[PDB]
């Protein structure tokens, strides 16, 4: 699973992924 669709998911779930780093 090359780095293509993987990001496609995070793009929508970026409001609970990077925001958790806090």
Structure method:
NMR
Sign, CA dihedral 15-17-19-20, equals: positive
Alpha-carbon span 5 to 22, nearest angstrom: 26
How many angstroms separate the CA atoms of 20 and 5, rounded? 22
Give Cα 8 to chain centroid, integer Å. 7
Give the pair of three-digit tokens for residue 12.
């929508």
Counts for the chain of helices (H) and strands (E), in that order? 1, 0
């Amino acid at each position: 699973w090359r780095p293509y669709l993987q990001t496609e998911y995070y793009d929508v779930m970026t409001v609970i992924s990077p925001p958790e780093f806090g």
